[PDB]
Amino acid sequence: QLQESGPGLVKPSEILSLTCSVSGGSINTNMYYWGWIRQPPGKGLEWIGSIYYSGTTYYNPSLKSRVTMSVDTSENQFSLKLTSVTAADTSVYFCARLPLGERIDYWGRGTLVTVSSASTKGPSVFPLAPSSTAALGCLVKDYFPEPVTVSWNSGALTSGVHTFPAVLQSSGLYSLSSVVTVPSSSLGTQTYICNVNHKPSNTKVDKRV
Amino acid sequence: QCVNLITRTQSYTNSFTRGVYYPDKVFRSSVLHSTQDLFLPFFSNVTWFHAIHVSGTNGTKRFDNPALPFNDGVYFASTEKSNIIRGWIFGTTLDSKTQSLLIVNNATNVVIKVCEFQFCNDPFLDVYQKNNKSWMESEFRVYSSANNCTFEYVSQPFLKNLREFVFKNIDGYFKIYSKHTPINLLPQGFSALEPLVDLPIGINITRFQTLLALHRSYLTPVDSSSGWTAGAAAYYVGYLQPRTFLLKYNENGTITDAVDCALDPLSETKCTLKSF
Amino acid sequence: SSDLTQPPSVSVSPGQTASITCSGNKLGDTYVFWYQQKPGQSPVAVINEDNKRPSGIPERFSGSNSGNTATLTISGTQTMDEADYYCQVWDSSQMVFGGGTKLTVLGQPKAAPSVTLFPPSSEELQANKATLVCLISDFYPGAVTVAWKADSSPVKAGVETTTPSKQSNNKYAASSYLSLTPEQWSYSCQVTHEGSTVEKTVA
Ligand SMILES: *[C@@H]1O[C@H](CO)[C@@H](O[C@@H]2O[C@H](CO)[C@@H](O[C@@H]3O[C@H](CO)[C@@H](O)[C@H](O)[C@@H]3O)[C@H](O)[C@H]2NC(C)=O)[C@H](O)[C@H]1NC(C)=O
Ligand SMILES: *[C@@H]1O[C@H](CO)[C@@H](O[C@@H]2O[C@H](CO)[C@@H](O)[C@H](O)[C@H]2NC(C)=O)[C@H](O)[C@H]1NC(C)=O
Ligand SMILES: *[C@@H]1O[C@H](CO)[C@@H](O)[C@H](O)[C@H]1NC(C)=O
Ligand SMILES: *[C@@H]1O[C@H](CO)[C@@H](O)[C@H](O)[C@H]1NC(C)=O
Ligand SMILES: *[C@@H]1O[C@H](CO)[C@@H](O)[C@H](O)[C@H]1NC(C)=O
């Protein structure tokens, strides 16, 4: 199990920093490397670098002057730093484990990093016409940057949930919507709240619908 | 990709009289000849290394396989059979800063290169199965980069059967001497090492490393590689010193006996008298 | 190695055999690994070491590697096999990926879009803002156009529409947003999909 952590918004010509935490095993092993792989939205995979328990590193030649990876065996973590970033560095970053440093067996979930000069803005969650089966949801209005995680009733109501992709508006801000299809026999005898989480803005909203 | 696999232990044994080699390419017969150059002294305290790869361990504190000093020259010995020792690495820093010499043997040829190798901490040939029939060897775990190559040499391979080598680095020449001897048990007796190749490379050598080969392990034919098969490689290392030797040539021209003049008073008397 | 070339798209009918090719100099001298990535997820290895299937992978995945060509073969291709496939190699000191091949499965049935419309919420109207949400789900293929109507009169300003996105069940989802002032607030979202129009009216 691999989990990424780090800022999702980075200003241009600054430093991107990410950290991967490993659970269920120890980095202190000779059988594995620990690497980073990025994917621009709609494009292919690119290997950034790999690191070893002893600090031995391999870097992508196209980024070798800007990439630096570190390993912390005591805390089971490994970190990536990328300097002088531009919009070409906006992508999803996976931390992966590499059996013998030549393939990938376990990937991370992936964290999206956007390189822009724009400021972080939290969303303006609205209840989208509760129940007008009946469809109900909440509108996640102007926010930056992507993504916003929307859940329903903590993690219980996950049956008819559909979270639609965000729209990028002419204002440079994203809007999002989520919908749950529920049986109309439970119009009033059921609590339906949606949880909107925006990490860059540190926003957590529980909205009644 | 560089991986640490080898745990090396050492014991100490006796080089009785091994390491004698022909000092020049001149044929002599039925004569005693006195020479002065780099020899392995008789009854020397040589080091017996066991390099071990055990698969299925935990932790990383057990991996210790550092490069050995070269001193003035090396006597290398082995009694292996399953091609686990493939060659050697010679150089000072063993990285891209300086030049290094790599010798590799694979079942048909010997490849000798002088390049600015960025050697791995624990270099070894990676032998992996292709198409369930062939075995292919990779150098991706020996060095990460080989640049500015200045020398190259390809010939027939150098490598119960004792294999002995003498490496010296004098006057811009890397001189190698070799011998193969069928043994039963380091043996007694004599086996003069014969010249193998004189490489014209002006390189500075302070350290050397033995290069092994490891086969990948497959639990089942339908599974991928889970690492490398457990292996062991044992070798002997001694160091040359400037000595004077009284060598005996027989009727056919072979070196059948030798005397270390500096070993003890009796051998010094033999060298002074030019008789055995 | 050092350069992997892949076709950008491969289209196959259901039940047939799909072949994805990776090309490189002397690929036969090195292992090639195949990764499958479905939309919104992380890649999973389908083939390792040119012919080995990891646990959990269907038996219809097979691999070959010879000369300068590595092949990933899917026999009896199913809709669930519609993903992006990458070939990966390790060269001397770098990991090399292919450009990626998108696998399409033909013969998919026609699905008319499902349209849901929501009026501006009473809370949003209190903030001197209004937004009409048009939600379009489960239509194949992903080519939909959205036009708005305000009492049988087209409105062109304030419309933001998403490009269709493939979801888990291989269908497509799109959205459209109508920004309004509450003074300007019946409204209808007209969704056309290969000649058929779906209308939802709100007031
Ligand atoms: C060949 O050389 C090795 C070293 O390369 C010699 O081993 C050394 O042996 C001496 C005693 O002869 C050890 O010194 C003493 O050993 C014990 C254990 O520590 C103790 O009495 C003293 O505290 C003292 O250290 C020395 O440690 C040991 N060195 C190593 C590195 O193991 C070996 O004796 C030589 N063999 C011959 C045949 O000359
Ligand atoms: C044994 O080593 C030799 C020498 O490096 C290899 O033969 C070379 O292979 C390369 C790569 O195909 C060719 O470009 C050279 O021309 C070959 N040199 C020769 C034949 O002298 C050989 O492939 C190696 N064999 C194994 C099994 O690893
Ligand atoms: C060879 O390299 C060593 C360091 O490894 C250095 O101290 C020595 O002076 C060098 N010898 C020559 C002749 O340059
Ligand atoms: C080879 O050596 C030159 C100087 O002789 C150096 O500038 C260059 O970086 C080296 N080549 C490589 C590929 O590192
Ligand atoms: C030289 O070789 C011959 C081969 O028949 C052998 O008989 C003879 O003893 C050898 N001479 C020596 C060992 O001095």
Side-chain angles (χ1 to χ4, degrees), chain B residues 24-207:
Chain B
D24 58 352
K25 296 179 176 66
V26 172
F27 173 86
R28 322 190 156 81
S29 49
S30 290
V31 77
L32 312 188
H33 195 241
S34 172
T35 61
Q36 182 199 17
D37 63 357
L38 299 176
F39 289 120
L40 182 68
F42 290 171
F43 306 99
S44 70
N45 189 2
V46 296
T47 175
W48 190 23
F49 295 110
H50 298 265
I52 297 168
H53 163 51
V54 295
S55 306
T57 55
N58 195 61
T60 49
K61 279 78 175 175
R62 69 181 305 277
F63 306 117
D64 193 1
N65 196 14
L68 304 170
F70 188 75
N71 281 296
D72 289 298
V74 165
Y75 162 83
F76 189 91
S78 195
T79 314
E80 291 288 325
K81 294 188 212 184
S82 75
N83 298 344
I84 191 165
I85 296 172
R86 299 297 203 85
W88 304 274
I89 282 158
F90 306 90
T92 42
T93 60
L94 313 175
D95 57 11
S96 46
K97 297 191 232 191
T98 61
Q99 290 196 109
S100 295
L101 165 72
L102 170 70
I103 301 165
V104 182
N105 286 278
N106 63 294
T108 49
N109 283 292
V110 63
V111 174
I112 297 176
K113 297 189 175 176
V114 175
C115 315
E116 290 181 335
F117 301 98
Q118 181 74 36
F119 285 122
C120 294
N121 192 3
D122 207 33
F124 68 96
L125 285 197
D126 178 29
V127 188
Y128 54 95
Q129 202 169 14
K130 271 261 180 192
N131 303 99
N132 290 318
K133 317 188 195 193
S134 160
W135 286 91
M136 310 198 54
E137 311 173 1
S138 176
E139 277 163 18
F140 292 163
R141 311 193 185 270
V142 178
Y143 52 91
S144 64
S145 65
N147 291 323
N148 274 310
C149 284
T150 52
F151 182 78
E152 188 164 4
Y153 173 85
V154 177
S155 183
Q156 310 281 355
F158 292 176
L159 295 168
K160 197 177 183 293
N161 193 0
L162 178 74
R163 299 177 178 178
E164 314 177 79
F165 289 89
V166 161
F167 302 110
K168 62 165 69 176
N169 192 54
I170 297 172
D171 291 359
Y173 278 76
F174 191 83
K175 296 183 180 180
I176 308 174
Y177 304 78
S178 179
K179 191 80 157 83
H180 282 55
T181 308
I183 68 172
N184 293 114
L185 59 91
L186 288 182
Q188 315 284 292
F190 275 87
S191 296
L193 270 60
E194 294 175 353
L196 192 45
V197 66
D198 294 331
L199 309 170
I201 47 168
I203 193 185
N204 180 20
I205 297 171
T206 304
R207 318 197 281 154

Side-chain angles (χ1 to χ4, degrees), chain A residues 94-179:
Chain A
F94 312 91
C95 67
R97 43 178 276 177
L98 278 66
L100 314 180
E102 66 180 1
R103 72 177 186 179
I104 299 97
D105 58 349
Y106 289 167
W107 294 73
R109 213 188 300 140
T111 182
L112 173 63
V113 185
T114 313
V115 178
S116 67
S117 63
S119 296
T120 306
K121 181 179 185 177
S124 182
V125 187
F126 294 119
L128 261 189
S131 298
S132 178
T133 60
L136 76 163
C138 47
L139 165 73
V140 184
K141 228 183 168 169
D142 311 84
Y143 65 86
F144 193 87
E146 197 178 1
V148 164
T149 56
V150 171
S151 181
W152 283 90
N153 280 128
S154 178
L157 180 57
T158 48
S159 66
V161 174
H162 187 184
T163 297
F164 286 71
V167 64
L168 191 50
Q169 313 159 242
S170 295
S171 64
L173 307 169
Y174 298 88
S175 282
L176 187 141
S177 186
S178 189
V179 172

Side-chain angles (χ1 to χ4, degrees), chain A residues 67-108:
Chain A
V67 62
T68 297
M69 296 174 49
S70 43
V71 64
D72 188 12
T73 51
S74 67
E75 295 199 348
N76 276 316
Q77 309 198 145
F78 60 97
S79 311
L80 161 76
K81 291 186 185 294
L82 194 65
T83 67
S84 179
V85 293
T86 58
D89 295 304
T90 290
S91 47
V92 182
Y93 291 70
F94 312 91
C95 67
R97 43 178 276 177
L98 278 66
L100 314 180
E102 66 180 1
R103 72 177 186 179
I104 299 97
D105 58 349
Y106 289 167
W107 294 73

Side-chain angles (χ1 to χ4, degrees), chain B residues 250-252 254 256:
Chain B
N250 68 334
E251 293 179 354
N252 302 303
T254 65
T256 48

